[PDB]
Amino acid sequence: SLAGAPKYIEHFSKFSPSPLSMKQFLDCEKTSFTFLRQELPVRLANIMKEINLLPDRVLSTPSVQLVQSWYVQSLLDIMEFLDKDPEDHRTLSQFTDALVTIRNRHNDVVPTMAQGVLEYKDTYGDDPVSNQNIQYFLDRFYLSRISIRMLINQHTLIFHIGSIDPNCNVSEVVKDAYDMAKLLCDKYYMASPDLEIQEINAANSQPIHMVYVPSHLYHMLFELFKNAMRATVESHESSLILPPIKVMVALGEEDLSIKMSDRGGGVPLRKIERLFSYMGYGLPISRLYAKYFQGDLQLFSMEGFGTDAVIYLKALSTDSVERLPVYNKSAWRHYDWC
Amino acid sequence: SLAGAPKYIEHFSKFSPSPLSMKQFLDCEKTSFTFLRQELPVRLANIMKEINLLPDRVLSTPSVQLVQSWYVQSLLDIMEFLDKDPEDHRTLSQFTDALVTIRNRHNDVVPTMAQGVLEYKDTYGDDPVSNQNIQYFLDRFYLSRISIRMLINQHTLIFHIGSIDPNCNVSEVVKDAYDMAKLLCDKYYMASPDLEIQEINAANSQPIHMVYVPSHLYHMLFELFKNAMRATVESHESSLILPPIKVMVALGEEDLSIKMSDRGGGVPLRKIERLFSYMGYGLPISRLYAKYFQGDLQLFSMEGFGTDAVIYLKALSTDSVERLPVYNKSAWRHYDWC
Ligand SMILES: O=S(=O)(c1ccc(O)cc1O)N1Cc2ccc(NC3CCNCC3)cc2C1
Ligand SMILES: O=S(=O)(c1ccc(O)cc1O)N1Cc2ccc(NC3CCNCC3)cc2C1
Asked: Which residues are recorded as modified (Phosphotyrosine) (chains A, B)?
């Protein structure tokens, strides 16, 4: 009773995704339904059109085809709601059930796509042109996915504000991530570095809080602690005294910056880019979480000494706007030294 | 008696520049002459072809036309030597005189091009497409120029190895740059931060030395000290105690890294890119000096606290290879979010 999926994909891919600010999220169920039965199809269709620009070699892999098939079914699942009445309580409850089913369907997207990359390399061998396309695509695909999960989680949790903490204590999240990383480091190495936190609240020399999704911040910090701890222990195999991991949390007028400093011996500059290369997606996905609300995650090493990692977040909820890829000419097109 | 310049430009722009390593420089006058009467025309012609890809608006400015005219005359100056005998001592002495004349002719290229950029903005207004082209071009143009000056200085100084110190003591250059920056800071503010240097020689816990052009390293460090000192003093107007500027010099297996840390209050991430934008070229040109021998210069701030600047250099002279732009399809061609 639905049209073929390509007709829906072509229809909804003409629209641009609509980015929301953290303030908008933070600040009804019928309104959410009527918004999402347009917006989720727009976001699904825009990235499905980009999948189709991948090299034939990558698109031919079974795991990429599988993920594509999930996106198709999820789009069709929502098309079932196009003619349904928001005033009918049953529409709203069925819609929430459908979003839960979509979220579960897509639970394993990240490792399934990674298997697709491995299939491409195993079947054909990799080549730099395809690899550059894959890198460009996967950043956008995984950020798109983060944004779809955000919309679904907000709706299902609401019907904290959903997953958003309006008073997230950043140092508490740092400590939670440290604690969990320490459990893992202690398991494998029987030791771990200590934590030192310093806060710099420039305008109010007050604990630092923000509006944020704590799970996203935790995810980033946990990945950074795992790397910093492993570096510290493995670079100190002959020492019983481990240098601590030092975290600075700074609150400025526009940025809330979190620096994690280790004395793990570092890595040469040549190898920094590889750390964000898909060709263990912990670091690239962590950086996407930072970018999702107009932040960033940057690494700076001193080979022979150690590494600084900085999470840059927007301090203000009004500056914290979704960063969403859009399928258009610039995107389509995107697919000199001696 | 020479052909028209376009015939030479077309001829020599077909060749790629030939990058030399620091080791090759470090490791005859007739050989230098016969090399340079090919290589300097190749480098001049390759970048002259790129000037021609600039937007009409930029190319139409009098200061860009003036610089172009210098490059034309310098190319023709060298064409006078195509049929001259290297065995004749007079050829060699006349060649050195000609290179000195070229260097003097081009002494003011950097501010003259900057005046061209200002003329473009004043005459037409700037636009983002032209601005992106200008940014791409000027990085390559100024790196090309650095490389031409290197070749000329090596020849004229030789006929230290030319401008190269095979045993450059990095901390001594840091101190020289600090001293000169302190003179300026003291003049305007009647105070300046102190310097603290720490060395980390990972394999030989020995003063850190390298093969490098000390003037280039000095240039980078002087620019970084000026910024760090200004930030520190201006962010501490109510304090008599100034936080020091801390420099770490680290020697690893592949990198020699120099970090300059200040507590000058920093800058929001949004504004970092502007610091390397031509649209006061001290920071972008300093980064080009770092890139010239396969290094880099990176800035990382914590708004509300301060800024780290890192100069990344290659530790080994065999890894220190000229980074040269080349005129080819990729370069010619070079001229998606919500
Ligand atoms: O790349 S890293 O500098 C880094 C990246 C990310 C980040 O967030 C933090 C970081 O420090 N770093 C991780 C790591 C892990 C293991 C080892 N083992 C080496 C084995 C041989 N002997 C020396 C130690 C070294 C390093 C170095
Ligand atoms: O951008 S920077 O962080 C920077 C860039 C480069 C670099 O190598 C080092 C750096 O620190 N920095 C330079 C500078 C210069 C002047 C001021 N004056 C402000 C006026 C209003 N009150 C606060 C101070 C601030 C800053 C900040």
From this structure: 188-189
